[PDB]
Motif scaffolding. Structure first.
Motif, PDB file in Angstrom:
ATOM      1  N   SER A   2       0.836  -1.204   0.000  1.00 13.13           N
ATOM      2  CA  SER A   2       0.000   0.000   0.000  1.00 13.13           C
ATOM      3  C   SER A   2       0.873   1.257   0.000  1.00 13.13           C
ATOM      4  N   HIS A   3       2.037   1.126  -0.646  1.00 11.80           N
ATOM      5  CA  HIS A   3       2.911   2.228  -1.065  1.00 11.80           C
ATOM      6  C   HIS A   3       2.378   2.895  -2.343  1.00 11.80           C
ATOM      7  N   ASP A   4       2.567   4.209  -2.472  1.00  6.64           N
ATOM      8  CA  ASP A   4       2.338   4.856  -3.762  1.00  6.64           C
ATOM      9  C   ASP A   4       3.637   4.836  -4.559  1.00  6.64           C
ATOM     10  N   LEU A   5       3.844   3.737  -5.272  1.00  2.86           N
ATOM     11  CA  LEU A   5       5.125   3.443  -5.886  1.00  2.86           C
ATOM     12  C   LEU A   5       5.405   4.241  -7.152  1.00  2.86           C
ATOM     13  N   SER A   6       4.495   5.139  -7.499  1.00  2.67           N
ATOM     14  CA  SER A   6       4.664   6.006  -8.660  1.00  2.67           C
ATOM     15  C   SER A   6       5.515   7.201  -8.295  1.00  2.67           C
ATOM     16  N   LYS A   7       5.736   7.357  -6.996  1.00  2.00           N
ATOM     17  CA  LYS A   7       6.539   8.433  -6.456  1.00  2.00           C
ATOM     18  C   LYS A   7       8.029   8.103  -6.542  1.00  2.00           C
ATOM     19  N   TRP A   8       8.343   6.823  -6.720  1.00  2.00           N
ATOM     20  CA  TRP A   8       9.724   6.352  -6.621  1.00  2.00           C
ATOM     21  C   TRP A   8      10.532   6.679  -7.866  1.00  2.00           C
TER      22      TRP A   8
ATOM     23  N   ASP B  46      -0.982  16.099 -18.278  1.00  2.00           N
ATOM     24  CA  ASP B  46      -2.082  15.148 -18.138  1.00  2.00           C
ATOM     25  C   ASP B  46      -2.888  14.978 -19.425  1.00  2.00           C
ATOM     26  N   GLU B  47      -2.940  16.030 -20.235  1.00  2.00           N
ATOM     27  CA  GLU B  47      -3.653  15.981 -21.505  1.00  2.00           C
ATOM     28  C   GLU B  47      -3.153  14.838 -22.390  1.00  2.00           C
ATOM     29  N   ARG B  48      -1.902  14.928 -22.810  1.00  2.00           N
ATOM     30  CA  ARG B  48      -1.341  13.955 -23.730  1.00  2.00           C
ATOM     31  C   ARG B  48      -0.686  12.775 -22.991  1.00  2.00           C
ATOM     32  N   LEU B  49       0.339  13.081 -22.205  1.00  2.00           N
ATOM     33  CA  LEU B  49       1.167  12.078 -21.551  1.00  2.00           C
ATOM     34  C   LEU B  49       0.574  11.638 -20.230  1.00  2.00           C
ATOM     35  N   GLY B  50      -0.747  11.590 -20.176  1.00  2.00           N
ATOM     36  CA  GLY B  50      -1.427  11.330 -18.926  1.00  2.00           C
ATOM     37  C   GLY B  50      -1.091  10.000 -18.285  1.00  2.00           C
ATOM     38  N   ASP B  51      -0.924   8.973 -19.107  1.00  2.00           N
ATOM     39  CA  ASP B  51      -0.802   7.612 -18.608  1.00  2.00           C
ATOM     40  C   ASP B  51       0.496   7.314 -17.848  1.00  2.00           C
ATOM     41  N   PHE B  52       1.449   8.236 -17.908  1.00  2.00           N
ATOM     42  CA  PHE B  52       2.711   8.042 -17.210  1.00  2.00           C
ATOM     43  C   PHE B  52       2.550   8.102 -15.702  1.00  2.00           C
ATOM     44  N   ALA B  53       1.557   8.860 -15.250  1.00  2.00           N
ATOM     45  CA  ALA B  53       1.278   9.037 -13.830  1.00  2.00           C
ATOM     46  C   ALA B  53       2.419   9.757 -13.160  1.00  2.00           C
ATOM     47  N   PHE B  54       3.009  10.707 -13.886  1.00  2.00           N
ATOM     48  CA  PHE B  54       4.133  11.494 -13.394  1.00  2.00           C
ATOM     49  C   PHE B  54       3.867  12.043 -11.993  1.00  2.00           C
ATOM     50  N   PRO B  55       4.749  11.730 -11.048  1.00  2.00           N
ATOM     51  CA  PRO B  55       4.611  12.200  -9.672  1.00  2.00           C
ATOM     52  C   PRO B  55       4.859  13.692  -9.535  1.00  2.00           C
TER      53      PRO B  55
END
Lengths: 47, 74
Positions: A2-8, B46-55
Motif C-alpha cells: 500500500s505504497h504509492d510506488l509512482s513516487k519512486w 495530463d492531456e497527452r502524456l497522462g498515462d505516465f502518472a508522473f509524480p
C-alpha cells in the motif's frame, strides 16, 4: 504494498529489487518498473 | 533556451523511467515553457502524456528545470 510506488525514482525501484527480501514489495516494484516501460511503449508506437 | 531545457528535462526522464528520449522530453519542454505554475504544467502533461502518472516531484523538477533554462543556469 500500500505504497504509492509512482513516487519512486527509477534508481529507487531497481535498487530495492535486488536488495529487499520482502517478497510483497519485490513484486510491487517489479510491477511498477514494468508499468513505466509499458506506458513508454504505448507512447513510442503512437509518436 | 530550448536545447538546454530539453537536456535538463531528458535527464529527469532517465532518472524516472530508466529510458531516455530527447523527443518526449522536448514535448514536455514545449508543453510547459509558457506556464505560470507547476499545476498548469501538470494539467497540460495530463492531456497527452497522462498515462505516465508522473509524480508531483517530477512535475516540480521539470518546472524547475525549464525555469533554469530561461535564466541561463547551465
Amino acid at each position: 504494498g500500500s505504497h504509492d510506488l509512482s513516487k519512486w525514482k527509477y534508481a529507487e525501484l531497481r535498487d530495492t529489487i535486488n536488495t529487499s527480501c520482502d517478497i510483497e514489495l519485490l513484486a510491487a516494484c517489479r510491477e511498477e518498473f514494468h508499468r513505466r516501460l509499458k506506458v513508454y511503449h504505448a507512447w513510442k508506437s503512437k509518436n | 533556451f530550448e536545447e538546454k531545457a530539453i537536456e535538463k528535462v531528458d535527464d529527469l526522464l532517465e532518472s524516472y523511467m530508466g529510458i531516455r528520449d530527447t523527443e518526449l522530453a522536448a514535448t514536455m519542454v514545449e508543453l510547459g515553457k509558457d506556464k505560470r505554475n507547476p499545476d498548469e504544467l501538470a494539467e497540460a502533461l495530463d492531456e497527452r502524456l497522462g498515462d505516465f502518472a508522473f509524480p508531483d516531484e517530477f512535475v516540480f523538477d521539470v518546472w524547475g528545470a525549464i525555469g533554469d533554462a530561461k535564466v541561463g543556469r547551465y
